[PDB]
Subunit: 467 residues, 4 copies
């Protein structure tokens, strides 16, 4: 998913709309925008579909105010309620959330038993809003001070487990934003000076959101850190986690994040290029005695990666596939992709793709290369084998739907009908990313090695999540 919040001095409805559009790649199932008008009342608009579908003219006019947050959903269901969520007591709080709680079932029971707070959905973003809400509910003075809010967030970080990048608003106070104690989910802080007296603030899941609005990049929101921006335009920061550490989602760099984004001081584009350098060198070694004629990227994530791989192997780079800018319904990847036949005929081709989950896409893309007249079809995956399920925001097939589960490269290869299959090495992937910011010692790579940094996941929770 993708979130965004703006504490401005002027109407921010169009701004959030534009910000979400550059973040539309993080979720396309639903979208939402909530603002605070001149009467300290929430204006909400949220539904299913793309941002351009959800927000029509009449909706934007209703979304008055200089402060507001937005959210775009990556499914998990789809027919369920979308974010941001809202509660009237205390004060009136709204919250958008990117990530996943691992003890949501435990928290839902506490909120009812200990607070008589009802949770109407299966979204753990509503659970998060209420956990944060019940803690704010313990104060009885007004207005709240920054320390009360930071105390509430600190108390929330003790109760909840998992990964979360959050942004929220409180009526008559301002905007808050915080990151989990592991820095798994991305979150950046921005700034924009209108004049010497007025400065706007915004947070977003990616820096591209900051860029497209003309917001000056400040920095990443630190792990376990919380931001608070009063409606007077004042910035308060505070460490609200006990033992914070930078374990950024590695797969953000591999695929999900935008290439022109900078996450934890790491250029997504550069790191992604470095992935090609690693994978290219590995291919030069492991496939030394194989004859390859051309490197053909599977658009669009693997384009710059495949280019570097070609640079290493000294082979030519060629646009063998074309992705259609638009796609239609069927009231079958050959509707997204089309093979430039002249680039496959009587050639040994190396296809480069970002990853392999189920193996369905890969099998078909290989068929297309052969139907185009390719002698041999070799495939390379920019990311290592994906054998374990993510529980930090990335939703994926059950561990059994994964083709790499209980299988090895040669078996996975034979199923997808490739002459050769080669995965990126997890350590090479780490080095490729670490090269841009060595301060980062360990990433979050559960989908690869099955090691969860939160330390609270068993087969029991995994079995549960399936149902």
């Amino acid at each position: 998913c993708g979130i965004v919040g703006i504490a401005g001095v002027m109407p921010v409805n169009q701004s959030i709309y534009d910000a979400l559009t550059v973040l539309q790649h993080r979720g396309q199932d639903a979208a939402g925008i909530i603002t605070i008008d001149a009467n300290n009342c929430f204006r909400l608009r949220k539904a299913n579909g793309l941002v351009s579908d959800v927000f029509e003219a009449r909706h934007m006019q209703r979304l008055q105010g200089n402060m507001g947050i937005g959210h775009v959903r990556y499914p998990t269901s789809s027919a369920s309620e979308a974010q941001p969520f809202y509660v009237n007591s205390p004060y009136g709080i709204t919250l958008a959330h990117n990530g996943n709680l691992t003890n949501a079932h435990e928290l839902r029971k506490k909120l009812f038993e200990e607070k008589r707070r009802h949770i109407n959905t299966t979204s753990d973003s509503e659970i998060l809003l209420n956990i944060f809400a019940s803690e704010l509910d313990n104060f009885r003075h007004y207005p709240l001070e920054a320390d009360n809010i930071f105390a509430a967030i600190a108390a929330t970080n003790r109760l909840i487990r998992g990964a979360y990048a959050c942004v929220a608003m409180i009526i008559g106070h301002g905007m808050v934003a915080f990151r989990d104690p592991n820095g798994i989910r991305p979150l950046v802080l921005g700034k924009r000076d209108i004049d010497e007296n007025r400065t706007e603030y915004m947070v977003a899941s990616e820096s591209v959101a900051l860029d497209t609005l003309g917001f000056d990049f400040l920095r990443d929101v630190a792990p376990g850190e919380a931001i608070y921006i009063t409606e007077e335009g004042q910035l308060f920061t505070r460490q609200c986690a006990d033992n914070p550490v930078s374990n950024p989602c590695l797969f953000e760099y591999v695929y999900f994040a935008r290439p022109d984004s900078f996450i934890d001081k790491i250029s997504v584009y550069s790191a992604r290029v470095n992935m090609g350098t690693k994978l290219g060198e590995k291919i030069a070694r492991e496939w030394e005695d194989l004859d390859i004629d051309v490197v053909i990227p599977i658009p669009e994530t693997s384009c710059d990666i495949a280019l570097e791989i070609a640079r290493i192997l000294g082979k030519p780079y060629r646009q063998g596939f074309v992705k259609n800018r638009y796609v239609g319904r069927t009231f079958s990847v050959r509707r997204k992709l089309n093979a430039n036949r002249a680039e496959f005929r009587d050639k040994n081709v190396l296809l480069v793709d970002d990853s392999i989950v189920r193996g369905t896409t890969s099998e078909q893309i290989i068929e297309m290369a052969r139907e185009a007249g390719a002698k041999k079809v070799y495939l390379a995956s920019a990311a290592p084998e994906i054998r374990f399920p993510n529980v930090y925001g990335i939703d994926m097939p059950s561990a059994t739907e994964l083709i790499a589960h209980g299988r090895e490269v040669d078996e996975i290869r034979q199923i997808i009908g490739a002459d050769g299959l080669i995965f990126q090495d997890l350590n090479d992937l780490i080095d490729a990313v670490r090269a841009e910011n060595p301060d980062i010692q360990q990433f979050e790579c559960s989908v690869f090695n099955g090691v969860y940094v939160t330390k609270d996941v068993d087969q029991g929770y995994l079995d549960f999540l399936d149902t």
Copy 2:
């Protein structure tokens, strides 16, 4: 506005939809339905427009549950009912009427409970006052006595008129009525089979008939109803000094004729209105010559028929109301009514309308009769002069827009351009209605005499309302 709530053992989504459709006359501006599904979670759908527009197939599929409440609003671009709060327990409420101390109540909710009110609707205020009272208990689940206690404390807090219906998660449906019994609310039951019994409440009895529910009785003034999730019915008075002062205007116009409010058939009442207006015309207009009595559809159709009987004159359909009415694009009573030319030609006509508020409609209708070739046009209002604003759930123009305000009958006659004008006496009206149930000794007729039963209506508020 119109309200409905059904506590049954079957999908009530369709039954509430049908219930609101027979109540659609009570409000066309907005509609809402909320239910409690098998997982004890609220399913909500509410928007602007008519019931037929608001609820499409996909919405009905969502509204699962064996218990729910409905609402149809009479005004406008604001948020509609029913409203919902997730804490405590999870409550929802639909309300018909008005709170005269809503501003006071909104302050208390904020300063004392930190509960934010996001809407100008006092139905959200009434929802939060109630929720805040249920908040004082610390056990679970609640007993019938606790719910009744909270409703009692509510009545001691809120002023004005109100008929409500609500749902508390894991408890059941509750419904109550203001101490003065101003706003309509009836209780009904249906025996599906010997083992289980369904219950429902609604604004008028026609909703009970439509669904096939047996009419039990009117909800007593200040009384509260509580149907558990197990179908157990609880009843208890929650006001200190209950009185039956039903809205007189429900009888004059707003309620359907086949409805029985407080043991009074609206139809039988409106006949008696014609009986006493005809008798009044017989004496005070004895010398005048009229050739025919013509009703202005459709409330006065049976009233004018009675007036015709008493006068011994012919009753003829002179006006026809267009069953379909369209828009007037920005790119007037004639688009709703049409004169049967033959019925007016060379005749002294007596027009019978249900009321006179602004006086605009009356003027145009008289002019239509003139264009239709009428020598003289006399207008008889089935209701007394309207001089004072209603603060109990009836939307009307400011006291200044009322033509009968600060004027006398003949002054009104000249402006609307009639040769003769006569109103029914307020005491004739009361007798006409009381003759169906002599038990009721007093009515809510502040729009006629300016006597406010709650007594808590002072100047300033009356002048504040014009905002």
Copy 3:
């Protein structure tokens, strides 16, 4: 179905919209409007649904022009149009009984394709085909009337039409039997500018402030040029006035004047006739109250109560709002105080399938009524209508093949009585005795158009 055409000096999009609303009772299935702008082009908007739902603000801005026509269809929509010759659009209320023959001729003789099943597109093309035979420009009034006269010789059945021709003006005509209603109205702005309009009922004329001129005579045609000139002419051989009798019974508006016959006054007379018959044939009948079934039979049952000397009371209340059902009680509600322990006389305007009556009678007993009797304002309906009236098949008609008692027994009534055909006729004829013979095929099975009987004769030849 209902049609309207306006030839004015000012924008008519709103006017046609308002006219269609008061005619909305003639069709709720679909609606369409087409106008001609200053560039002499057709602006069209048509789709399924009510008039209020079909035309939104964005459509009305497209419907520019001082002339145009509208249509509401009783369950592709109208109007249709063709580009050659000149550009012709047409809306039609009625039905063609030789549509298959006409469709065959248009293809073999003129190479004109028909893409829909609507005989409005057929009628439009027959008319357009005739206009194609002229090569001079502009066409004159005589040319157009000849084209309409030629059409009347080819087509068969009942029809009230309104049409427009690019760069010429509006035309409207009526079938040789005057079965489907069509009226003409005017409206003076100044002495040199006069607007004209035509419609299915006079209520459309009244609602717009147009002066009623006269019924369009059977077989007659109307023509209004762009310059606002009126031409009339008889375009049929041996025209006759055989207006639809059922228009007066139900379909038409009570405040409409069809062929100089007030629909309202007509429906009163029917009650007078039906009330007098009950006094004679049901002299032993013991009823406590006369109850109408909303909304057509209200002023009929009122008259029936007068003739019987019994009281009249609103026993049923129809819901003003339609309610969809997902995957009669919905529209009618019984005032259970007017039935309780009473012998009631229910008055409905007609019985077709017998479904509505049966359930309504059950609703009467449910309300505690002792005996439920049923009077029908219209005679037994035993035959199909092929003249532009949507009714279920003859196989679904309950009165067909069954007698009065058997009918009464299927709907479960203690008493069933029908209006007599001749009594009904006199009721309507009393308003305008110049009308000798009505079109009432649904009742007696007599079809006035001569084309229909020969069709039977050729049907018999196939049975050999």
Copy 4:
């Protein structure tokens, strides 16, 4: 715009939907499909918006038949102003068109004055449909023979002027398709053998690929195609002096890279464009020092890669295209479609490569985006030559009064867009770049560059215009 026509033995609604989608790049303003059902009747669905928006499930179920045509239109009112159009007489004819008629006015008059046929829209597609119809109206037999139809198209070609690639259907006959005498607008023919042979035609070969049709050839300039309801194929030359003058801008920008237009791979052509441009920069920009070559997504991506290869400089993605753009609500910057990767500009002499310059608006903003990103000197290379003239052969572009390269020389344009350096592709180099993939193409349609219009009526009307000045 884009067109497609399928003549098969199975339902073609989905097939045309899939075809229009891969041609969606040729026009996004409106779309329309029309088929002939079992009853030999026309089923039509057309309205404004993308293909995916115009065609919902309820519209797809009504589009029954085994033969039909589709259309996508670029931005021009009503839904009846979209294609295809349709006339009920004679026979029943529908037609979809990609191009532009240079004598639409005189054709509107002849149709009215001579045939009494009314034109209701501003689309000359409706004009083209009525011209072809009135010619078919001269015959008095049935059914028409393939020879009769071809004769009608021939007479049509002698009447109309301009550029066009059409596909049409005639009730009870089959699918017709033809191309203008100059072969300006593209059109390709394909087949599919299910056991019976299906046939389709489309603007680009990619439509054939995505549906699994085998590629046969380009429809020849002035040639016509006729496919009957029974699946018989006819071809005929209906132009008197047919010549191949393919639209040069198809290869530059508008055509899909994986399409083969007139035996020329669009992708190979653009690579060659990068070659010719890179070589020109190495010649005329000896001294100037750059640190990186940055393409402006997405057309110039592979072109910039080649230019960088030639220049021996690095290729880096300085700009990223927003794949989702939204509405800007009243109550238009290029930042909505483009974002800068700040790290790739900072303290560098960048060479930007855009496919073209029309108004100079986009270029100016993109140059500033580079400047604020940290770039020292920003150079701009255009894959296409100066655009100095309006296109009247079916290409949609701003009014000729907005063309920055008109009456202005390169250095004037450079300081208006605020570039440190500006360079255009030479038309001769560009022509050699495309003609290298198919030397038998001698002359292109590049009127937007040289102001040379291959159709004589244009140059003739120009002199008639000059006469009005006196």
